[PDB]
Amino acid sequence: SMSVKKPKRDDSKDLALCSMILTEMETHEDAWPFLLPVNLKLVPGYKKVIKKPMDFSTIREKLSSGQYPNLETFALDVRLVFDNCETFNEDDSDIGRAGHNMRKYFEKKWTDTFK
């Protein structure tokens, strides 16, 4: 509360560390469905159904331009990518499986880096 603060967590490396995680997600062999924005002209149903599209290239640009106020807003957009994928793709599809795999890969790196 006013003039009453928990001890200051060092957040000075968060930007660099989020960037390194994102590099590791970008280079994973199952990243291909997620690298670029879904083409809303060419994929029927996507525009109407997926209210907030997100992809790695869009996260990279937001990261690089100071549009994440903290590491939690960064994680929310990564998770959005996988939540969208689950909304639109059957579990038993290449893309469906890719999204489960990448979500797992992310959550481990997140816990190991920050928790």
PDB file of C-alpha atoms in Angstrom:
ATOM      1  CA  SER A   1       0.000   0.000   0.000  1.00  0.00           C
ATOM      2  CA  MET A   2       1.187   3.658   0.248  1.00  0.00           C
ATOM      3  CA  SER A   3       4.861   3.748   1.419  1.00  0.00           C
ATOM      4  CA  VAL A   4       4.698  -0.102   1.998  1.00  0.00           C
ATOM      5  CA  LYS A   5       6.451  -2.203  -0.601  1.00  0.00           C
ATOM      6  CA  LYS A   6       7.630  -5.781  -0.990  1.00  0.00           C
ATOM      7  CA  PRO A   7      11.357  -6.081  -1.716  1.00  0.00           C
ATOM      8  CA  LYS A   8      12.284  -5.015  -5.350  1.00  0.00           C
ATOM      9  CA  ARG A   9      12.602  -8.054  -7.746  1.00  0.00           C
ATOM     10  CA  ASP A  10      15.354  -7.417 -10.312  1.00  0.00           C
ATOM     11  CA  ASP A  11      13.478  -7.023 -13.617  1.00  0.00           C
ATOM     12  CA  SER A  12      16.390  -5.398 -15.544  1.00  0.00           C
ATOM     13  CA  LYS A  13      17.159  -8.598 -17.555  1.00  0.00           C
ATOM     14  CA  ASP A  14      13.526  -9.527 -18.370  1.00  0.00           C
ATOM     15  CA  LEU A  15      13.616  -7.935 -21.862  1.00  0.00           C
ATOM     16  CA  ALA A  16      16.723  -9.863 -22.834  1.00  0.00           C
ATOM     17  CA  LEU A  17      15.525 -13.070 -21.356  1.00  0.00           C
ATOM     18  CA  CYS A  18      12.006 -12.826 -23.085  1.00  0.00           C
ATOM     19  CA  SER A  19      13.932 -12.239 -26.353  1.00  0.00           C
ATOM     20  CA  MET A  20      15.977 -15.383 -25.835  1.00  0.00           C
ATOM     21  CA  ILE A  21      12.892 -17.459 -25.092  1.00  0.00           C
ATOM     22  CA  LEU A  22      11.209 -16.067 -28.199  1.00  0.00           C
ATOM     23  CA  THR A  23      14.315 -16.970 -30.274  1.00  0.00           C
ATOM     24  CA  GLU A  24      14.080 -20.517 -29.011  1.00  0.00           C
ATOM     25  CA  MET A  25      10.349 -20.630 -29.938  1.00  0.00           C
ATOM     26  CA  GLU A  26      11.114 -19.146 -33.407  1.00  0.00           C
ATOM     27  CA  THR A  27      13.691 -21.829 -34.158  1.00  0.00           C
ATOM     28  CA  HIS A  28      11.744 -24.883 -32.922  1.00  0.00           C
ATOM     29  CA  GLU A  29      10.897 -27.191 -35.811  1.00  0.00           C
ATOM     30  CA  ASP A  30       7.156 -27.089 -34.911  1.00  0.00           C
ATOM     31  CA  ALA A  31       6.991 -23.237 -34.952  1.00  0.00           C
ATOM     32  CA  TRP A  32       5.916 -23.094 -38.676  1.00  0.00           C
ATOM     33  CA  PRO A  33       2.134 -22.618 -37.997  1.00  0.00           C
ATOM     34  CA  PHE A  34       2.950 -19.669 -35.677  1.00  0.00           C
ATOM     35  CA  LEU A  35       5.757 -17.707 -37.371  1.00  0.00           C
ATOM     36  CA  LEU A  36       3.550 -15.251 -39.307  1.00  0.00           C
ATOM     37  CA  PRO A  37       0.047 -13.833 -38.949  1.00  0.00           C
ATOM     38  CA  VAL A  38      -2.718 -16.133 -40.295  1.00  0.00           C
ATOM     39  CA  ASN A  39      -3.764 -14.735 -43.721  1.00  0.00           C
ATOM     40  CA  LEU A  40      -7.300 -13.514 -42.970  1.00  0.00           C
ATOM     41  CA  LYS A  41      -8.135 -13.201 -46.674  1.00  0.00           C
ATOM     42  CA  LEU A  42      -7.175 -16.836 -47.352  1.00  0.00           C
ATOM     43  CA  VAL A  43      -8.375 -18.767 -44.295  1.00  0.00           C
ATOM     44  CA  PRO A  44     -12.144 -18.924 -44.082  1.00  0.00           C
ATOM     45  CA  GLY A  45     -13.611 -18.519 -40.642  1.00  0.00           C
ATOM     46  CA  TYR A  46     -10.419 -17.139 -38.999  1.00  0.00           C
ATOM     47  CA  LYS A  47     -11.298 -13.476 -38.958  1.00  0.00           C
ATOM     48  CA  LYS A  48     -14.729 -13.928 -37.375  1.00  0.00           C
ATOM     49  CA  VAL A  49     -13.869 -16.672 -34.976  1.00  0.00           C
ATOM     50  CA  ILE A  50     -10.460 -15.571 -33.590  1.00  0.00           C
ATOM     51  CA  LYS A  51     -11.071 -12.291 -31.932  1.00  0.00           C
ATOM     52  CA  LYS A  52      -7.385 -11.542 -31.159  1.00  0.00           C
ATOM     53  CA  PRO A  53      -4.944 -13.101 -33.687  1.00  0.00           C
ATOM     54  CA  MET A  54      -1.354 -13.409 -32.409  1.00  0.00           C
ATOM     55  CA  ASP A  55       1.831 -14.884 -33.914  1.00  0.00           C
ATOM     56  CA  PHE A  56       5.565 -14.972 -33.139  1.00  0.00           C
ATOM     57  CA  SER A  57       6.511 -12.239 -35.668  1.00  0.00           C
ATOM     58  CA  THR A  58       3.935  -9.888 -34.076  1.00  0.00           C
ATOM     59  CA  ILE A  59       5.235 -10.690 -30.589  1.00  0.00           C
ATOM     60  CA  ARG A  60       8.797 -10.041 -31.844  1.00  0.00           C
ATOM     61  CA  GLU A  61       7.807  -6.602 -33.194  1.00  0.00           C
ATOM     62  CA  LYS A  62       5.907  -5.690 -29.985  1.00  0.00           C
ATOM     63  CA  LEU A  63       8.937  -6.833 -27.914  1.00  0.00           C
ATOM     64  CA  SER A  64      11.446  -4.919 -30.020  1.00  0.00           C
ATOM     65  CA  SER A  65       9.373  -1.663 -29.843  1.00  0.00           C
ATOM     66  CA  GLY A  66       8.608  -1.513 -26.091  1.00  0.00           C
ATOM     67  CA  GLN A  67       5.015  -2.511 -26.320  1.00  0.00           C
ATOM     68  CA  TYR A  68       5.215  -5.059 -23.454  1.00  0.00           C
ATOM     69  CA  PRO A  69       5.022  -3.212 -20.134  1.00  0.00           C
ATOM     70  CA  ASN A  70       6.186  -6.281 -18.195  1.00  0.00           C
ATOM     71  CA  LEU A  71       7.069 -10.009 -18.603  1.00  0.00           C
ATOM     72  CA  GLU A  72       3.443 -11.084 -17.805  1.00  0.00           C
ATOM     73  CA  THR A  73       1.990  -9.204 -20.778  1.00  0.00           C
ATOM     74  CA  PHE A  74       4.614 -10.993 -22.922  1.00  0.00           C
ATOM     75  CA  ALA A  75       3.517 -14.455 -21.605  1.00  0.00           C
ATOM     76  CA  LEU A  76      -0.144 -13.591 -22.222  1.00  0.00           C
ATOM     77  CA  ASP A  77       0.524 -13.008 -25.941  1.00  0.00           C
ATOM     78  CA  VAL A  78       2.604 -16.226 -26.258  1.00  0.00           C
ATOM     79  CA  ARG A  79      -0.251 -18.193 -24.572  1.00  0.00           C
ATOM     80  CA  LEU A  80      -2.774 -16.401 -26.890  1.00  0.00           C
ATOM     81  CA  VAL A  81      -0.988 -17.921 -29.853  1.00  0.00           C
ATOM     82  CA  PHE A  82      -1.656 -21.445 -28.409  1.00  0.00           C
ATOM     83  CA  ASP A  83      -5.157 -20.716 -27.212  1.00  0.00           C
ATOM     84  CA  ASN A  84      -6.035 -19.503 -30.678  1.00  0.00           C
ATOM     85  CA  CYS A  85      -4.513 -22.613 -32.205  1.00  0.00           C
ATOM     86  CA  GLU A  86      -6.638 -24.851 -29.927  1.00  0.00           C
ATOM     87  CA  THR A  87      -9.772 -22.867 -30.770  1.00  0.00           C
ATOM     88  CA  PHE A  88      -9.326 -23.409 -34.515  1.00  0.00           C
ATOM     89  CA  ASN A  89      -7.569 -26.772 -34.942  1.00  0.00           C
ATOM     90  CA  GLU A  90      -8.435 -30.333 -33.993  1.00  0.00           C
ATOM     91  CA  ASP A  91      -6.019 -31.912 -31.370  1.00  0.00           C
ATOM     92  CA  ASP A  92      -5.482 -34.715 -33.915  1.00  0.00           C
ATOM     93  CA  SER A  93      -3.984 -32.544 -36.732  1.00  0.00           C
ATOM     94  CA  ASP A  94      -0.429 -31.541 -37.463  1.00  0.00           C
ATOM     95  CA  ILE A  95      -1.128 -27.912 -36.418  1.00  0.00           C
ATOM     96  CA  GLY A  96      -3.138 -29.035 -33.388  1.00  0.00           C
ATOM     97  CA  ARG A  97      -0.201 -31.175 -32.180  1.00  0.00           C
ATOM     98  CA  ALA A  98       2.300 -28.419 -33.018  1.00  0.00           C
ATOM     99  CA  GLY A  99       0.431 -26.060 -30.719  1.00  0.00           C
ATOM    100  CA  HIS A 100       0.414 -28.466 -27.803  1.00  0.00           C
ATOM    101  CA  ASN A 101       4.097 -29.138 -28.258  1.00  0.00           C
ATOM    102  CA  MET A 102       5.075 -25.436 -28.456  1.00  0.00           C
ATOM    103  CA  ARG A 103       2.965 -24.577 -25.434  1.00  0.00           C
ATOM    104  CA  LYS A 104       4.782 -27.277 -23.410  1.00  0.00           C
ATOM    105  CA  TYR A 105       8.173 -26.081 -24.663  1.00  0.00           C
ATOM    106  CA  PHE A 106       7.281 -22.490 -23.717  1.00  0.00           C
ATOM    107  CA  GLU A 107       5.958 -23.236 -20.251  1.00  0.00           C
ATOM    108  CA  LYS A 108       9.112 -25.106 -19.310  1.00  0.00           C
ATOM    109  CA  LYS A 109      11.431 -22.327 -20.484  1.00  0.00           C
ATOM    110  CA  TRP A 110       9.208 -19.813 -18.684  1.00  0.00           C
ATOM    111  CA  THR A 111       9.313 -21.690 -15.326  1.00  0.00           C
ATOM    112  CA  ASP A 112      13.061 -22.406 -15.603  1.00  0.00           C
ATOM    113  CA  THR A 113      13.930 -18.819 -16.496  1.00  0.00           C
ATOM    114  CA  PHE A 114      11.668 -16.909 -14.077  1.00  0.00           C
ATOM    115  CA  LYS A 115      10.165 -19.267 -11.311  1.00  0.00           C
TER     116      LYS A 115
END
